[PDB]
Homo-oligomer: A and B are copies of this chain.
Amino acid sequence: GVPTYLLPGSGQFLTTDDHSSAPALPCFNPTPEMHIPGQVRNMLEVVQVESMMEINNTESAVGMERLKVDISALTDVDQLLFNIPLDIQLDGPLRNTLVGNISRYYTHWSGSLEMTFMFCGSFMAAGKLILCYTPPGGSCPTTRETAMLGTHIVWDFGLQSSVTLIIPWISGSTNANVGYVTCFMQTNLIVPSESSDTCSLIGFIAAKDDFSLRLMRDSPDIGQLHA
C-alpha cells in the first residue's frame, strides 16, 4: 500500500503533545456557546489588575494589619516608614498579590511594574511623604538625604490621595534582589484635634501592558486531604 517506517520517538506518550485525538462520544451536540460576561483570553489581563501590597511586613502583624501602614504623630518625625524589596520570586510584600501568584507560575519574567499608593486618613489631615525608588544594585537608603537623591517623588496629603509610581524595566529572572521602594516621612503628620492621630496608607502593585512571562513552571505555593 503505502511504504512506511517507524522513526525514533514512536509510540511514546509526551505530556506536552498536541495531536488530534479520537473523540469518545462522536455526534454528541455540545451545549452552545452562550456569551458569558468577562471572558479572559490572556493571563496578562489578570496581572494588569491592581492588588494590595502587604506593606507592613514586621513581626506580630497578622492578617488585616499588614496591608495598612500606621502613620501618626509618633512616627519618628522623619526616620523611615517601610521598604518594598521588588522580589516577586522571593518573600516580601509582593509574595501574595496577583502579580505575585501568577509570576510564580512562570520562570523568566520581565516588564515594568507600577505601584499606586493611597492615603486613607481624614480630609483635613495633611502631611508630606517622599517615596523613593532605588534601581537594582543601588543601596537601600537609610536616611532622607540619601533617599532624596534617588529618583523620588514628594507626595502631599491634600488633593493627591493617590500616587501612581512607575517602576522601569527590571527583567528579574538564590536570594536575588532587583530594587527597593522606600518611603520616608517628610513633614510631621498634621491632623486636627477632631480626627484621630493615626492615619494609614495602602499600596497597589499592578503590572503594565509590557509585562512578559515565559517558561511556565509549577508554583511552589501549595505543597504537601479528606474525601
Contact = CB atoms under 8 A, between A and B. Distances in A.
A3 B7 contact: yes
Interface residues of A, number: 29
A173 to B, nearest CB: 11
A6 to B, nearest CB: 4
Nearest to A18: B26
A29 interface: yes
Nearest to A24: B16
A10 interface: yes
A13 B7 CA distance: 8
A26 B16 contact: yes
- From DSSP, what is the main secondary structure of chain A's interface residues? loop
A8 B9 CA distance: 11
A46 B35 CA distance: 34
B4 A3 contact: yes
B10 A5 contact: yes
Contact of A17 (B4, B18, B20, B22): B22
Nearest to A13: B8
A6 B10 contact: yes
Interface string A138-179: 000000000000000000000000000000000000000000
Given A2-B3, A6-B10, 20 more contacts: A1-B2, A1-B3, A1-B4, A1-B20, A2-B5, A3-B5, A3-B19, A4-B5, A4-B7, A5-B6, A6-B6, A8-B13, A8-B17, A8-B19, A9-B21, A9-B22, A16-B24, A17-B22, A25-B215, A28-B215
15 contacts: A1-B3, A1-B5, A1-B19, A1-B20, A2-B3, A5-B6, A5-B7, A5-B10, A5-B22, A6-B11, A8-B11, A8-B13, A9-B22, A16-B25, A28-B214
- For the complex of A and B, list the 9 residue pairs with the smallest distance between their C-beta atoms, beginning with the closest: A1-B3, A5-B10, A6-B11, A4-B4, A8-B13, A5-B7, A6-B10, A2-B4, A3-B7
